[PDB]
């Protein structure tokens, strides 16, 4: 069937909110007084650092993991993404 | 960082996770320190108790559970810490002063 | 009107119908069944 197959082959042819201040972004109640705390007063450090000791640090519990990561969804951020230029010279605390 | 600055940060620590079963093993093991010695220095800055103001977030969830929604006594207290309405019940006539029942009526 | 959405309408829900609470935990038990299941794309009907 090959050698008859063969004969037919001829005939089958910048963002507002991440430059905002933790306390002052519209989220829950203990979702934005415990990043303040461990060097976090911006939106910019919190996507730039690992999740696997930000959350497993004894100030964050479980419930957490859904708001930093309903930012982290919407706008295209990574997991411990680099940016170009996030902090101004106006940085403080509470 | 003084420890009024602690307790300050325990008034928002608890005001979003009251419906959540919320034991002290967990408020001390996310605070950084112990299971008894955050009961101490609760002591010295606001007058009052931790394990029953606990409570008297939950008994005000309650009565806020009760005059917007239409959800039963006996199950209100399954997620409250409590494993029947029998206790549940009881403690809202010393923080409140009234039934669990006569609540919703008096508008 | 479903089975299945009583098991959705959890025991939060029931009790402040007026005119069982004990016994449909019976009635669960019996034939393999539990009471409060959280339930996605019901009832598709």
Same mark, same amino acid.
């Given at each position: 069937?090959?050698?008859?197959?063969?004969?037919?082959?001829?005939?089958?042819?910048?963002?507002?909110?991440?430059?905002?201040?933790?306390?002052?972004?519209?989220?829950?109640?203990?979702?934005?007084?415990?990043?303040?705390?461990?060097?976090?007063?911006?939106?910019?450090?919190?996507?730039?650092?690992?999740?696997?000791?930000?959350?497993?640090?004894?100030?964050?519990?479980?419930?957490?993991?859904?708001?930093?990561?309903?930012?982290?969804?919407?706008?295209?951020?990574?997991?411990?993404?680099?940016?170009?230029?996030?902090?101004?010279?106006?940085?403080?605390?509470? | 960082?003084?420890?009024?600055?602690?307790?300050?940060?325990?008034?928002?620590?608890?005001?979003?996770?009251?419906?959540?079963?919320?034991?002290?093993?967990? =408020?001390?093991?996310?605070?950084?320190?112990?299971?008894?010695?955050?009961?101490?220095?609760?002591?010295? =800055?606001?007058?009052?108790?931790?394990?029953?103001?606990?409570?008297?977030?939950?008994?005000?969830?309650?009565?806020?559970?009760?005059?917007?929604?239409?959800?039963?006594?006996?199950?209100?207290?399954?997620?409250?810490?409590? =494993?029947?309405?029998?206790?549940?019940?009881? =403690?809202?006539?010393?923080?409140?002063?009234?039934?669990?029942?006569?609540?919703?009526?008096?508008?």
């Amino acid at each position: 069937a090959t050698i008859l197959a063969e004969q037919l082959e001829a005939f089958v042819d910048f963002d507002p909110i991440l430059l905002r201040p933790v306390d002052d972004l519209e989220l829950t109640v203990r979702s934005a007084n415990c990043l303040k705390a461990e060097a976090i007063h911006y939106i910019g450090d919190l996507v730039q650092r690992t999740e696997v000791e930000l959350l497993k640090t004894p100030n964050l519990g479980k419930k957490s993991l859904t708001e930093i990561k309903d930012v982290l969804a919407s706008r295209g951020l990574s997991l411990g993404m680099r940016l170009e230029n996030w902090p101004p010279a106006s940085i403080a605390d509470e | 960082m003084s420890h009024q600055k602690i307790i300050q940060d325990l008034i928002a620590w608890i005001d979003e996770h009251i419906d959540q079963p919320l034991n002290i093993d967990v =408020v001390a093991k996310k605070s950084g320190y112990s299971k008894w010695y955050l009961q101490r220095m609760f002591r010295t =800055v606001t007058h009052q108790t931790l394990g029953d103001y606990i409570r008297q977030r939950r008994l005000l969830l309650a009565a806020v559970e009760l005059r917007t929604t239409e959800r039963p006594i006996f199950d209100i207290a399954m997620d409250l810490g409590y =494993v029947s309405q029998q206790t549940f019940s009881r =403690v809202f006539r010393r923080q409140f002063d009234r039934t669990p029942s006569d609540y919703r009526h008096r508008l």
